[PDB]
Amino acid sequence: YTKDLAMSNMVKDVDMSEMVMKRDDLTYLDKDMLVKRSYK
């Protein structure tokens, strides 16, 4: 088996279906780099 510890420790009750990566070339192994779409 394989597990993802990126969100195992970041246990918060929020949905991330709309979040985006900090850099667009990151993969599923970098879920800790997801940042919610902000407005400058």
Comparing CB distances to a second copy, the nearer of 9 and 17 is 17
* Count of all residues that appear for the chain in the document: 40
By CB under 8 A, is residue 26 in contact with a second copy?
A: yes
By CB under 8 A, is residue 39 in contact with a second copy?
A: yes
Of positions 4, 7, 10, 29, contacts a second copy by CB under 8 A: 29
| Cβ partners under 8 Å of residue 8, min gap 6 | none
How far CA 11 is from CA of 2, 3, 15, 19, in Å, comes to 19, 15, 11, 16
For binding to a second copy (CB under 8 A), which residues are involved? 15-18, 20-21, 23-29, 37-40
